[PDB]
Write a protein that binds this DNA or RNA. Structure first.
Ligand code: MG
Ligand code: MG
Ligand code: MG
Ligand code: MG
Ligand code: MG
Ligand code: MG
Ligand code: MG
Ligand code: MG
Ligand code: MG
Ligand code: MG
Ligand code: MG
Ligand code: MG
Ligand code: MG
Ligand code: MG
Ligand code: MG
Ligand code: MG
Ligand code: MG
Ligand code: MG
Ligand code: MG
Ligand code: MG
Ligand code: MG
Ligand code: MG
Ligand code: MG
Ligand code: MG
Ligand code: MG
Ligand code: MG
Ligand code: MG
Ligand code: MG
Ligand code: MG
Ligand code: MG
Ligand code: MG
Ligand code: MG
Ligand code: MG
Ligand code: MG
Ligand code: MG
Ligand code: MG
Ligand code: MG
Ligand code: MG
Ligand code: MG
Ligand code: MG
Ligand code: MG
Ligand code: MG
Ligand code: MG
Ligand code: MG
Ligand code: MG
Ligand code: MG
Ligand code: MG
Ligand code: MG
Ligand code: MG
Ligand code: MG
Ligand code: MG
Ligand code: MG
Ligand code: MG
Ligand code: MG
Ligand code: MG
Ligand code: MG
Ligand code: MG
Ligand code: MG
Ligand code: ZN
Lengths: 157, 68, 105, 208
RNA sequence: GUCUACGGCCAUACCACCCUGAACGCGCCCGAUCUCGUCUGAUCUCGGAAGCUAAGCAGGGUCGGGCCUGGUUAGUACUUGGAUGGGAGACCGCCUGGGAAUACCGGGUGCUGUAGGCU
RNA sequence: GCGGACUUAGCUCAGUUGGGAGAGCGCCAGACUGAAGAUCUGGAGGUCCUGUGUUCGAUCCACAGAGUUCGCACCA
RNA sequence: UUCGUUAAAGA
RNA sequence: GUUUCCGUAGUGUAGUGGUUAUCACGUUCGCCUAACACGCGAAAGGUCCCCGGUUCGAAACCGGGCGGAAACACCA
RNA sequence: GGGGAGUUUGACUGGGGCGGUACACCUGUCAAACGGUAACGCAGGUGUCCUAAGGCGAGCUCAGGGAGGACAGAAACCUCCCGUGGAGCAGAAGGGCAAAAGCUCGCUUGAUCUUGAUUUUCAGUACGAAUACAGACCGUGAAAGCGGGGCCUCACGAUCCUUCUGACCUUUUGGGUUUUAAGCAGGAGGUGUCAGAAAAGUUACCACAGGGAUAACUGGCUUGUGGCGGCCAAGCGUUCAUAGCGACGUCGCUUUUUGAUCCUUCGAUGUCGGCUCUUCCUAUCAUUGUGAAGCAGAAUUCGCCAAGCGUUGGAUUGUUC
RNA sequence: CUGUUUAAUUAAAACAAAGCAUCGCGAAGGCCCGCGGCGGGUGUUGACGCGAUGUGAUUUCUGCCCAGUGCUCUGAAUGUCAAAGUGAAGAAAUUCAAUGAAGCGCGGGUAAACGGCGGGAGUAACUAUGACUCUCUUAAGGUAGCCAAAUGCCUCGUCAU
RNA sequence: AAAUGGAUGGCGCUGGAGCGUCGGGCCCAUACCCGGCCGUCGCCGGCCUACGCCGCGACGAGUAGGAGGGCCGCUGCGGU
RNA sequence: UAUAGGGGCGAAAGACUAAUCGAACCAUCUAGUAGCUGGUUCCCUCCGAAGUUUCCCUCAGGAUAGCUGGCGCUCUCGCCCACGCAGUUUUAUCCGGUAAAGCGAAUGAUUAGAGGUCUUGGGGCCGAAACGAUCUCAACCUAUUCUCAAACUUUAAAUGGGUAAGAAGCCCGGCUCGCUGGCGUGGAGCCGGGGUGGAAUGCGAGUGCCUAGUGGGCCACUUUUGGUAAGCAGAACUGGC
């Protein structure tokens, strides 16, 4: 009964936020959208030709097809039944890269360099990403000044 | 005789009765939905790969087996 | 709305943009001894009354004004149809307008 | 006139007078200053303000009756132009009425469930100031008694506080007499202008 | 230390006012016969180069307005989860975690790629 | 959807053997007029519902469209 | 062919 | 309470198929009578209920109030 | 041609009908910062309009404000400056747009034909709408490119039948020619109850299968409304607030009225009033014991303990009243 | 008025009734029955008869409207109008054109046929009520009578008994 | 201040058997741990009805409904 | 004796027509249909719901999807290292526009005081009148100040959503292309080779067929819509009946 048409809840989401109204920058176009690139979706208000849908905003997908002045992305969308991989045709202006895969490739390159150094010098490296360890038995310093005594203040309106 | 209209109560529990599934298995991804000019590239490229790849790859395999 | 007299549109016989005379589509008189007409006459002849249902509750007030496009060039004679959305008023081919014209009425 | 026993604490979103209502009648209160409206800042040193405690809704008719009672006690106590009272609270929340019996079960049912605008109340947060009275130093008890007479009339529980500030300004009375004379604060009618140091030099040349 | 042509970041780079500009360059400027389009060579095109940094432009400044950033506001308003907590209600307090913004004050105000020329 | 009729000067109508226009009710100026009524004479107001072809020339010829009425069975 | 009415006395 | 309709000179009303201030009564001036009625020649009187939107242009088409007018409020 | 026959009387609904369409499609909120998410929730719209208000290219910048200029005034025309969207984009709103998607000018119909894929609703079915492509013929532009309708969000329709278009198409039944008929592919003639039946009313003479999924009694929650109290006191009370009153505001009780819901009852709980009869409550009319008055006496008013005992005879109306 | 009626909840103000009316029909007919025949009822009957209705003794009255829905009359002067028939095109199916029976439309009559009967404003030397007057208006605007009626929401209308 | 007589459950309770802060003990549910028995499932053993015999461990509630077993039962038929 | 069932008869009540009449009685079609009441017969064991999406002249019903059971199949463990999954956390990377806050910031409202003097309107003064001059008021501007907005917002939480955390990955060498094109240029596909120790915790997983019931729900913490409120009507998460 909410009149389920296209973009019935997009008063804010497909809007340019503040001090950004105008022509689109050209570095949005001048990007390398090859196949297999993990990209993100963020709709634009200026270009009304290729915004995907209000349901795919903020999602993350994989490129399968590239054309003249758009791109094709497969996106895992959740519905009532189960999540499904869906094929969308989105223009270039709505799409940016995802730096998480780039950070993972940087970690893979650093691990390969550490493994090359390990095979060279015979030194074990422990290249697994361990989480935040518990704090070691470290040592504090209280020289010069006594610890400052804190007391709670009285109530004043 | 007014009835209850619409609800999504007791729905996520029915979703998780059977463990909502990723498709999770697509090796050698499907090819339909891709640019027909790119397909006119790729099919002719594949059949000429099937035709004319013998002698140069054979001599390259012999050369890399001799050099390694 | 307003459509012009002539229009250069792709005709399927020769395969080029040729000019087309544009006329209004008439539905035309229904031919007797068609298949459903003979079936309805055979079904109606007899004490059965109105056998097939007749439509009553009409609510649309307009019709899709479609255009008959004829090839202007000789020995082609290609005729086909173009569909436009529903319109109430329809000018045939005349009375083009201007922007700087005064209103004298 | 329905009681305030039924129109009560905040249970709905604020529904103000706007393009979408277009059916609200006129509010009960129209004015908000009653004492010396053109009073200077140095005329009345102190002020007492009425702090709420319950997250409630105060009606414009209750604000009317309270400001009439406080004005009457001030003109009985310190006479005309010996006080300045300001109702800090402004009514914007428009309540709705669903009236019936326009005496049988045959007018309507719960068919049309949305109501018509009856009156205007004001949503009050905890700690929000209802009224503020600025007077002389010797009129400390009269402000307390006037806000007590308003306390007997407003619903719920609320307290009184004599402010540390100098009247309606946001600056302290302890630093006011020390700091209006040297550099910064300049009197502007009943208000006080605070100059920063991030000004053009022509303002400092026009001053001093 | 700079400019010109094309730019990327889109006000740290806009707006108002006041100073400086040596060499190329950028421009204001000098005229309609051809290309040109207008009521008007005002705008756009055609071959310039007599003067000029007055203007654009490029730098500096304004206890400048805005912008960005940092304290204060503030562990405050809020908020995931909990109680056989309080209160008649209104709401409030606590355990566990996350944690915002305006007034107020302080600092800055262009960084660079390609190609080319002047000290 | 057929067949047929009215589409005309402020209003009501006439007008094909196709050769440019009328009658009355309305307006103005005149004729007798104690005041009116009535009568008589002369003018303005018609690109004939519109468009397309025949004719030297469509108000009446032929087709289509746009408002009104008239009888008919009304298979999405 | 249409064309109504003019108080009261006071000679 | 619900659904429709109306509001125009002092009075009753017409009027847009967007581009008037319309008809009669009422008031006033003159002629006619000796003088009133009546008749004739004329003039004045409009916020087209109030406020906005559409359009070059609204009272006119539409939206919200104001004051009235019609129909229903039935089964227990 | 209701003389007679057969059939129908849409659905939602704080019971049904009346009222409305929340029955089909859009905007914002509800909506709790992914998305989805209800009601007869709210504020609104739509069944159209455009051969230009489509497409391209070029030029210009809007609404408003200030200053000036003969008639010129509040608005007639010209010029200068400020002017970030305060204008316009056909229309209800939201988003978006400045050498622009706004205004003007010049050409043009890409609003053309055809095969797939995807998004939206979603069951991942259809329709409508839309997206990125691909193949022809093209329009504009110097080219870049843009364009297969409207800057985007809606503006529209199944089977069967009818009609039109196309191949120098197939079948027209033993074989040929011609006419006709059928088919193939795509445009139209609609189901607004909008995924689509062809449809008036009454039954107090009614009947059947059922429902307390569903009203008219009581009872249950609530107390708007009715009634009964309290709080501060501007004033009435000749003077004087509180002897008695009390506005403007505000806090409570009751089911003795009415309203709201449908929780029980539809294989029945007999529906008003009166007569008669028993019990209970106090928010006390009188009686017993008291306090206060603007209580001199008498007669009244306000309160407390207090339901033990009384609380009529009648004319009218079926009466409750 | 006497009479009759809901046997088994009504006895009536209900029905019937004489009186007053209206319409159809001159027998190859009016109104009806029947599946059928020139078969039947009225009919062994003939406008003082039969058939179909309204109202309901006597007295006094029977107002005004054919705009609407009905009923009836007239004319191929005239629009529409189906089968059949006529002419033409073709090889034929088929198509076209004119000719046009009833009915409808065009005109009239009929309301003791169904039915219907208006709302504002200004007006009299105390004031009100208002003879009278202007305009819109339909087909006609409730006439003679009667009344809060068995008919009146306000209503327990106002006065009298 | 409300209608039959009635409700911290009643009885009762005031140096508490009321109120708020708490200390140590005490009572039990089909909850937990250990153990005995039945059944299901999983893994498995053996060349002792193989459709039988053991071994280990974790688990058993449930309307509508769906399966597996019955050396539960009734009537009749052929072998026995 | 005559009138016999959609018929008769009726001084008219739809009354009477064999105790039945607003359409008699008997038999047959007929065991008429019913989305509608009631009922549905032995035990034990195992698993075990829903009152929801969409469509229907649909609202007491059905279809479809979801929830569920049964039947299997493909594999994996038991002998310094596997494959894979998660109503979960961690490390990185995006998304939003609610709570809050603000309006001396745009839009819409809204209070009060001050300063300035352009403009018109209304009073008073110098006096023929005179923007010749003066005071106040009205409107305007500037800096302030009060209170807000579900259909306002510069800013902007908590909670949450998507993605990556490797042998399907990284690098090297070489062919093909009718795609593209200054270029052996770019991009896709194909072939050969190299090294697996790539966040935590827990778990053995993938897949095919058939189908019943379900499609009347309710309550509670928290967030909320209408109503004065309800043991009222309607939504979101989670849990329970
Ligand atoms: Mg349901
Ligand atoms: Mg047949
Ligand atoms: Mg026949
Ligand atoms: Mg020239
Ligand atoms: Mg020239
Ligand atoms: Mg020049
Ligand atoms: Mg200079
Ligand atoms: Mg310069
Ligand atoms: Mg600078
Ligand atoms: Mg600054
Ligand atoms: Mg909490
Ligand atoms: Mg007279
Ligand atoms: Mg019938
Ligand atoms: Mg219904
Ligand atoms: Mg959301
Ligand atoms: Mg959410
Ligand atoms: Mg342009
Ligand atoms: Mg400018
Ligand atoms: Mg718009
Ligand atoms: Mg193309
Ligand atoms: Mg439907
Ligand atoms: Mg019926
Ligand atoms: Mg009867
Ligand atoms: Mg009350
Ligand atoms: Mg119920
Ligand atoms: Mg009840
Ligand atoms: Mg319910
Ligand atoms: Mg009984
Ligand atoms: Mg009983
Ligand atoms: Mg007693
Ligand atoms: Mg009897
Ligand atoms: Mg007689
Ligand atoms: Mg008589
Ligand atoms: Mg009569
Ligand atoms: Mg014939
Ligand atoms: Mg007649
Ligand atoms: Mg009558
Ligand atoms: Mg009088
Ligand atoms: Mg009379
Ligand atoms: Mg007790
Ligand atoms: Mg104790
Ligand atoms: Mg079990
Ligand atoms: Mg029979
Ligand atoms: Mg029968
Ligand atoms: Mg009987
Ligand atoms: Mg019957
Ligand atoms: Mg029968
Ligand atoms: Mg049976
Ligand atoms: Mg349903
Ligand atoms: Mg199913
Ligand atoms: Mg399964
Ligand atoms: Mg299973
Ligand atoms: Mg939102
Ligand atoms: Mg808020
Ligand atoms: Mg079953
Ligand atoms: Mg059910
Ligand atoms: Mg509920
Ligand atoms: Mg439980
Ligand atoms: Zn052609």
């Amino acid at each position: 009964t909410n009149t389920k048409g296209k973009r019935r809840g997009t008063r804010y989401m497909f809007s340019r936020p503040f001090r950004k109204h105008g022509v689109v920058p050209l570095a949005t176009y001048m990007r390398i959208y090859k196949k297999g690139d993990i990209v993100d979706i963020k709709g634009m208000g200026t270009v009304q030709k290729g915004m995907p849908h209000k349901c795919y905003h903020g999602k993350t997908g994989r490129v399968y097809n590239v054309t003249q002045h758009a791109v094709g992305i497969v996106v895992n969308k959740q519905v009532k039944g189960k999540i499904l991989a869906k094929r969308i045709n989105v223009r270039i202006e709505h799409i940016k890269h995802s730096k998480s895969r780039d950070s993972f490739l940087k970690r893979v390159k650093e691990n390969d360099q550490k493994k090359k150094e390990a095979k060279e010098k015979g030194t074990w490296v422990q290249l697994k990403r361990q989480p935040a360890p518990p704090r070691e038995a470290h040592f504090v310093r209280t020289n010069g000044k006594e610890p400052e005594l804190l007391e709670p203040i009285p109530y004043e309106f | 005789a007014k009835s209850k209209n619409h609800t999504t109560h007791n729905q996520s529990r029915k979703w998780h009765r059977n463990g909502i599934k990723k498709p999770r298995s697509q090796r050698y991804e499907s090819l339909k939905g891709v640019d027909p000019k790119f397909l006119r590239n790729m099919r002719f490229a594949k059949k000429h790969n099937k035709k004319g790849l013998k002698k140069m790859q054979a001599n390259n395999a012999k050369a890399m087996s001799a050099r390694a | 709305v307003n459509v012009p007299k002539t229009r250069r549109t792709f005709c399927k016989k020769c395969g080029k943009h040729q000019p087309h005379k544009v006329t209004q589509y008439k539905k035309g008189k229904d031919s007797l001894y068609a298949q459903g007409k003979r079936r309805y006459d055979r079904k109606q002849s007899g004490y059965g009354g109105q056998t097939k249902p007749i439509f009553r509750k009409k609510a649309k007030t307009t019709k899709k004004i479609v255009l008959r496009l004829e090839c202007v060039e000789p020995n082609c004679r290609s005729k086909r149809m173009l569909a436009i959305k529903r319109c109430k008023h329809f000018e045939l081919g005349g009375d083009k307008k201007r922007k700087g014209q005064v209103i004298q009425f | 006139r329905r009681p305030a026993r039924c129109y009560r604490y905040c249970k709905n979103k604020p529904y103000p007078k706007s393009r979408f209502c277009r059916g609200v009648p006129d509010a009960k209160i129209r004015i908000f200053d009653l004492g010396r409206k053109k009073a200077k800042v140095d005329e009345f040193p102190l002020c007492g303000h009425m702090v709420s405690d319950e997250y409630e809704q105060l009606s414009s008719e209750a604000l009317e009756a309270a400001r009439i009672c406080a004005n009457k006690y001030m003109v009985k106590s310190c006479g005309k132009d010996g006080f300045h009272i300001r109702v800090r609270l402004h009514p914007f929340h428009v309540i709705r009425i669903n009236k019936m019996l326009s005496a049988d079960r045959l007018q309507t049912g719960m068919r049309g469930a949305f109501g018509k605008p009856q009156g205007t109340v004001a949503r009050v947060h905890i700690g929000q100031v209802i009224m503020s009275i600025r007077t002389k130093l010797q009129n400390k008890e009269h402000v307390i008694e006037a806000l007590r007479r308003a306390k007997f009339k407003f619903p719920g529980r609320q307290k009184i506080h004599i402010s540390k500030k100098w009247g309606f300004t946001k600056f302290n009375a302890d630093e006011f007499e020390d700091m209006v004379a040297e550099k910064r604060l300049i009197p502007d009618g009943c208000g006080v202008k605070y100059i920063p140091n991030r000004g053009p030099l022509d303002k400092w040349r026009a001053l001093h």
